Description:
Number of strands of chain C: 8
Helix content of chain C: under 10%
Structural class of chain A: mainly beta
Helix content of chain A: under 10%
Family (chain C): Belongs to the protein kinase superfamily. TKL Ser/Thr protein kinase family. TGFB receptor subfamily.
Subunit structure (chain C): Forms an activin receptor complex with activin type II receptors such as ACVR1B. Interacts with VPS39. Interacts with DYNLT1. Interacts with BMP3. Interacts with BMP2.
Distance between the termini of chain A: 15 Å
Number of helices of chain A: 0
Radius of gyration of chain C: 13 Å
Order of helices and strands of chain A: EEEEE
Shape of chain C: flat
Protein name (chain C): Activin receptor type-2B
CATH class of chain A: Mainly Beta
Largest interface: A-C, 15 and 18 residues
Organism (chain C): Rattus norvegicus
Shape of chain A: elongated
Structural class of chain C: mainly beta
Strand order of the largest sheet of chain A: 2-4-5
Strand content of chain C: 35-45%
Strand order of the largest sheet of chain C: 2-5-4-7
CATH topology of chain A: Cystine Knot Cytokines, subunit B
Order of helices and strands of chain C: EEEEEEEE
Number of domains of chain A: 1
Radius of gyration of chain A: 16 Å
Oligomer: heterotetramer
Subcellular location (chain C): Cell membrane
CATH architecture of chain C: Ribbon
Distance between the termini of chain C: 31 Å
Number of domains of chain C: 1
Largest sheet of chain A: 3 strands, antiparallel
Amino acid sequence: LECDGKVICCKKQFFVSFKDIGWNDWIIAPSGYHANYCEGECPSHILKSCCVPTKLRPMSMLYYDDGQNIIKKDIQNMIVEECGCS
Amino acid sequence: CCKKFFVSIIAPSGYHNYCEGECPCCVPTKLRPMSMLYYDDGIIKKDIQNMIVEECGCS
Amino acid sequence: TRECIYYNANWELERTNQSLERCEGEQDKRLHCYASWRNSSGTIELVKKGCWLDDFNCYDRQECVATEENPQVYFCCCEGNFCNERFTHLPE
Amino acid sequence: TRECIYYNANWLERTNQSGLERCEGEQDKRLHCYASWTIELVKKGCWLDFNCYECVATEENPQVYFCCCEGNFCNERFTHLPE
């Protein structure tokens, strides 16, 4: 359930530039990733439920390791794909 | 909130977990992939992602 | 399926082939391919090439073109089998 | 470090028949290796973090044998047992 004008429990798609976080230097690509946060109301039986990321997905990355060494990895659990209720 | 259990694909036989306790929601933050050997339309090795709840917590 | 041109300049230490890669595709989400290099004096040095996971920045790009101007390490993204055998530079 | 004997009999993809498989991954997390099996090596390779805590086979009368071990290149040798 992707979001729009806020009402229930949805997923909020927000993008962020690494330059804006101070990380645009050790990372060659991508330029930034998707912060997707779960925001929304939930039904009650479940005791109590909260909107939470129900699924994560990998983000590919090309950056430098500490030895000014270029690395390429598929970063695990970095993008919140879907939101569900606890 | 606390990390509390194990249940019984070629291998393994059974994987592990649950997050329980209260918040002033207590759900897992750290997860765990684990290996699986099985049959695919009459075998493959995929080291599989997040089958186990590593560490819990609140929202 | 989606396969790509594979290249590793640091293949030796990392004990890998130096150069085709088949994209692992996790449950029908777009698949792309990349290329990275250097335009140091007026000479291009490869760094790496291979599959690249669903990137909002790679779709519908049939040709691998580096848009970024004046970087240390160039990088381009593309969609389409072996779309990275060729790569270029376009500042804007 | 953890490295291990690698084997794939169905190598229609990028993966070669044999050779080792450098095993990397999670931090302080234990790493393990494996092997599965005229004797037919179905597949051998690295195995993620207890069935692994020598590579020996425990589960009786199976059709596809499997062992799990910790310690570099432990999977090269494998054998059979009872329960």
